[PDB]
Design a protein around this ligand. Structure first.
Ligand code: NA
Ligand code: NA
Lengths: 453, 128, 455
C-alpha cells in the first residue's frame, strides 16, 4: 500500500548547506536550486545531485515573506540538467513566496515552473524549508502542478523522515510502527543473521520487505535460519521463497518480495534500489561491495552486519575458539563507505573470487595469503548481531541514546573478550565518491558486468 | 576479429579504440578475457608480436586485474628465460604465458588502461 | 533425553573432592545422603555429606581403604525419617570394606545393610582426581542400575556421562561436540514470551533433547510483534502459546521433542514438570513467576538462567514522558550459590503488591497507596532478542568455557542500549542467605508454598 509513494532524498551534507543558505539569520527568504537524478522504479525517487545557491546580493528583493531573484540562475540550472534531463527543484524559505525576474519580464512561481519544463523535458518541483530543517515539496509534471512529494528524507547521523500527511514519536511506540509501515526494507542475504534481521523487520511493521538470496534451505542450516523446517531442508527450498511465505503468514498480507538471485545481478540491484534501508547480511566481500555501491548510488542508508568465530589449534589441548566477535556498520549517503572502512578491499575480493585451483596455486606462490579458519556459525551469536543491527536503525530514526548517534557509526563486540568498542564517523577517512546520487547511470553501479547491452 | 562477448568500462573501450588495437572480448566458460591481437613488442624477444590478454575479474574495476598473459610464450632473444613467467593458462584451447606481475589496485584510477600500462612497462623492462 | 541422574552442588563436590584426594595418593571415603525426585527420570539430590576421618579409617592404602561401620550406621539414622538414599563415595580405585567392633563387611554386604536400615535406594560411586564422577545404584540392597549422568552446575557446568571415552576429548563451543551434550539434556522455558519464544527457538535449534514449555497465555494480534513463529491465524484462533510453539518445534526438528504445559508456573503441574529439566530459562516478567522459578532451581538442584528487559520511562517536567533507558538483565543461579532472592530480583513486598485481589487493588488506588501507572514503554522484538541471545549464550559459555575471563565474573549481566554500557557482577560480590530448600526435593508443601500443596 504505502510502498509506491514517491521520494525526495537529500544527503546530510547537501541539506546542511541548503539549510544554512536558506536561514542565514537575517530572517529573510533565500533561494536555491536542487538538480536531481531519478530512479523511476516501483516508486519515483528524486536523488539530489547538485546544489546552486542564489547569492543574496544578486537578488532584487529579500523580505521575511517574499524574495525576487534573477532568472540567470534558472538558466544555469537548465544548462546543468539539459544533458541527462535531470529534475530541477526550486527551494525557498518557510513562507515560500517568490518571483523570478529577467531584464524584460517577471515570472510567478507557476510561470517559473513552466519555464523549467520548457528547458528540460522532465519532472520538476518546488520545495519549502522551515528553520528546523523539515522540507515539503510539490512535483510539477509537464510544467503544471501535479502531485506532492509523499516523503522528503535525509539519512544522516540521525535519519529524517518528513511526511506530507504530517511531537516526535518516541521509540517502541505506535508512532514507530506507523513510520515503518510506510517504508521498504531490503534484506540482502536471508542467512543466519539475515533471517533474524528479516524476522525483526517483519514483526516491527515494515510495509515492504525485499529478500535477496540465491541459496536454499539445507539440513546444515536448519540450526540457524528462522522459520526453516525439516521439510524445507529435505526439499531444498529457496531461502527467499521460504521466508516470503513466512512473512505472508505472520503479517497476513503479501508484503514480502522474494528475489531468488545473487545481489550481484541487475534484478537484485534494481529491486534493492527501491528500498528505504538496506540490511546487508551476506558473508562475502563482493556481496558487501555490491551493497555499498547501491547505498551511495541510490542514497539509501545501509546497515552491514557481520560475525566471525576464529579458531586456532593448540598442540597441548587441540582446536580452541580464538574469539567470538560481531560487527555492525551504519553507512549514510555521503559519509564514510564500507570501502573507506576496509570492510572489503580489491585484494580481499580477488582472493575470494579465485577458483579452487587458482586459490591453491596462488597461495603456493605466496602472493595471496591464506584464509582464516573459523568454527561453525551459531544461532546465538547471529541473534546478538542481528538484534544490534536493527536496533541501530531504530536509534537513528527515533533517537533514545545518551550520546550522539555519530559516536556509534561502527560497533565491534566480543563475546569471548567480553568487550565492545565503537568508532565515530569523524575518525574515519572518506575518499572521493563521484558515484553519489548517480542512480542507475549505465554501467549499473559502475560495474561493466551489471551493465545493459 | 570483432568478437565482443561482454562490454568493458566505456573509458576502457574508448581507449582501446583510440589506440587502434584489434581487440576482442571473449567469454570462455565464466572467464571474461580481453585479448589484443598483434600486440607490437619491443626488440629483444624471440617474437615481435603476441596476443596480449587480461583476465577481467568478477567485480571489475573494484576487483583488481592481477596479471597479464601473452601468446606465443616469450623468451629473451638470447634464450634466457624471463623471471616469473613459467606458468601457463588455457585460453580457448591456447596455452598463454602468464607473467606473474603484481601491483596495488585503486578502483578510483585503475582500469584495463593502467593494467595495459603495467604490461608494457614490464615488457620494456625485460629486454633492457 | 532420559536417564537416572545424580546432581551435586559445587560446594559439596569441592569439599568432597578435597577429602577424597588429600594429596598422599591414598584412597579416601565419604558417604553422601541424597534426597530423591521420582518423576519422568530419577533425580538424586545430594543433601548431606558425611566425611570419614583418615584417622577413623583403620587402614588407608593407594588401592584400598577400610573405614568404621558406625558411620554407615549414623548415616542410616539420618535417612530413616524420609527413607533417603545413601551413596558411598570413594577414590579412583573404589575397593573398600566396612569393619566393625565385631565383624566386617564387603562392598555388597555394606550395600545390603543400608537397605535393611532404610527401605529405599542406595548406591556407591567413585571419583577421580580431576573430579569426574561415575556411580551405580542398588535397590533392595542388591545391584540395580548405573547412573547415566553425574552433574555439577557451578561457575562451570560439569556433565559426567556414563558413556565416556578417553579418546573422546572435551569439545569446544559452537561445534558439533556442543550439540551432542545438548541432545541429552532437557531445558524448561518458563514463559513463551517475547524473550522466551526467542530462548525456546534457540534451544530447539541448538539440538536440545527435550524442551518443556510452560505458559498459560495465548497468541493475540497484540503480540504478533514479539512471539516467534506466531502467525495471524493463531491470533485469530487465540491459540495457546505453548501449543503454537510445540507444533513449531515439531516442524523444525521433525520430531515431537517438546512438552507443552498450558498452565502457569504457579501450579503443581508446572513445577513438577519443570523439576525434571536440566536447565531452567525463566522468561516471565512477574515477581511471582521469578520467585517460583528460583524455588524450583534450589529445591531440585537445576541451574537457572533468569532474563528480563525493561524500557523505563520518566516524565520530563516540560517535555513529557521520555525513554529513561533501554535495559536488559541476565542472572545465572547455580545450585548452592546466591539466589535471585539474595540478589533482590524479587522481595516479599514486591510479590505482595503485584498479586493483589481486585478489591485490594481498588482500595489501594482509592486511598492513594498506588497510582496504577505504566512506568514502562512497549517491549520491542529487538531488545527481547538482544537479551535472549545473551541468555542462551551464557549457558553455552558455562557448559563450554570460551571467554578470556572466568565465567564467575559474569554471574549477573546488565546492558544499556541507550547508555551504551554493559556491567558485570561477580558471584563473590553477592551476599548469600541460608538456603533451607537446597536439595530438599518435592517435600510438601511443594516449594514450601501451601497453595502449591496437595490438600
Ligand atoms: Na563526503
Ligand atoms: Na552457599
Amino acid at each position: 500500500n504505502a510502498s509506491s509513494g514517491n521520494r525526495l532524498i537529500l544527503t546530510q551534507e547537501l541539506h546542511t548547506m541548503l539549510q544554512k543558505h536558506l536561514f542565514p539569520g537575517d530572517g529573510k527568504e533565500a533561494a536555491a536550486i536542487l538538480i536531481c537524478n531519478r530512479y523511476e522504479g516501483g516508486r519515483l525517487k528524486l536523488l539530489a545531485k547538485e546544489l546552486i545557491l542564489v547569492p543574496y546580493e544578486e537578488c532584487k528583493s529579500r523580505t521575511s515573506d517574499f524574495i525576487a531573484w534573477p532568472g540567470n540562475y534558472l538558466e544555469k540550472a537548465i544548462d546543468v540538467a539539459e544533458e541527462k534531463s535531470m529534475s530541477i527543484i526550486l527551494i525557498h524559505s518557510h513562507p515560500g513566496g517568490f518571483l523570478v525576474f529577467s531584464d524584460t519580464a517577471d515570472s510567478s512561481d507557476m510561470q517559473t515552473m513552466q519555464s523549467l519544463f520548457q528547458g528540460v523535458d522532465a519532472i520538476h518541483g518546488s520545495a519549502i524549508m522551515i528553520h528546523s530543517g523539515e522540507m515539503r515539496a510539490r512535483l510539477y509534471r509537464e510544467g503544471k502542478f501535479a502531485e506532492n512529494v509523499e516523503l522528503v528524507t535525509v539519512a544522516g547521523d540521525d535519519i529524517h523522515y518528513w511526511w506530507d500527511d504530517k511531537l516526535k514519536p518516541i521509540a517502541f511506540t505506535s508512532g514507530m510502527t506507523d513510520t515503518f509501515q510506510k517504508l521498504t526494507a531490503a534484506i540482502i542475504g536471508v542467512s543466519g543473521t539475515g533471517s533474524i534481521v528479516a524476522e525483526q523487520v517483519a514483526r516491527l511493521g515494515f510495509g515492504e520487505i525485499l529478500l535477496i538470496d540465491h541459496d536454499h534451505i539445507e539440513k546444515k542450516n536448519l540450526n540457524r535460519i528462522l522459520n526453516s523446517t525439516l521439510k524445507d531442508a529435505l526439499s531444498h527450498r529457496p531461502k527467499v521463497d521460504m521466508f516470503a511465505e513466512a512473512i505472508r503468514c505472520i503479517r497476513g498480507e503479501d508484503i514480502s518480495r522474494p528475489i531468488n538471485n545473487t545481489i550481484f545481478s541487475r534484478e537484485a540491484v534494481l529491486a534493492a534500489a527501491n528500498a528505504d534501508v538496506l540490511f546487508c547480511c551476506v558473508d562475502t566481500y563482493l556481496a558487501r561491495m555490491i551493497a555499498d555501491r547501491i547505498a551511495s548510488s541510490f542514497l539509501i542508508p545501509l546497515l552491514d552486519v557481520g560475525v566471525k568465530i576464529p579458531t586456532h589449534v593448540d598442540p597441548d589441548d587441540g582446536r580452541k575458539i580464538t574469539d567470538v566477535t560481531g560487527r555492525i556498520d551504519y553507512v549514510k549517503p555521503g559519509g564514510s563507505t564500507l570501502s573507506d572502512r576496509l570492510v572489503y578491499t580489491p585484494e580481499l575480493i580477488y582472493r575470494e573470487n579465485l577458483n579452487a585451483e587458482e586459490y591453491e596455486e596462488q597461495l603456493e606462490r605466496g602472493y595471496i595469503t591464506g584464509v582464516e579458519e573459523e568454527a561453525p556459525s551459531v544461532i546465538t551469536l547471529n541473534m546478538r548481531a542481528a538484534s544490534a543491527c536493527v536496533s541501530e536503525f531504530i536509534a537513528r530514526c527515533f533517537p533514545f541514546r545518551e550520546y550522539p548517534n555519530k559516536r556509534f557509526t561502527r560497533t565491534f563486540f566480543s563475546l569471548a573478550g567480553v568487550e565492545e568498542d565503537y568508532i565515530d564517523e569523524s575518525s574515519i577517512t572518506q575518499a572521493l565518491n563521484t558515484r553519489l546520487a548517480v542512480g542507475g547511470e549505465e554501467p549499473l553501479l559502475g560495474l561493466p558486468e551489471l551493465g545493459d547491452k | 576479429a570483432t568478437r565482443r562477448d561482454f562490454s568493458l568500462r566505456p573509458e576502457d573501450e574508448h581507449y582501446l579504440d583510440e589506440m587502434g588495437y584489434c581487440w576482442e572480448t571473449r567469454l570462455v566458460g565464466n572467464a571474461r578475457w580481453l585479448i589484443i591481437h598483434d600486440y607490437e613488442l619491443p626488440d629483444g624477444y624471440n617474437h615481435h608480436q603476441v596476443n596480449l590478454a587480461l583476465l577481467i575479474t568478477s567485480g571489475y574495476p573494484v576487483n583488481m586485474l592481477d596479471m597479464f598473459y601473452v601468446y606465443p610464450p616469450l623468451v629473451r632473444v638470447n634464450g634466457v628465460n624471463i623471471p616469473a613467467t613459467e606458468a601457463t593458462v588455457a585460453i580457448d584451447s591456447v596455452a598463454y604465458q602468464r607473467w606473474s606481475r603484481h601491483r596495488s589496485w585503486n578502483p578510483e584510477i585503475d582500469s584495463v588502461i593502467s593494467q595495459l600500462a603495467m604490461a608494457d612497462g614490464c615488457l620494456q623492462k625485460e629486454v633492457g
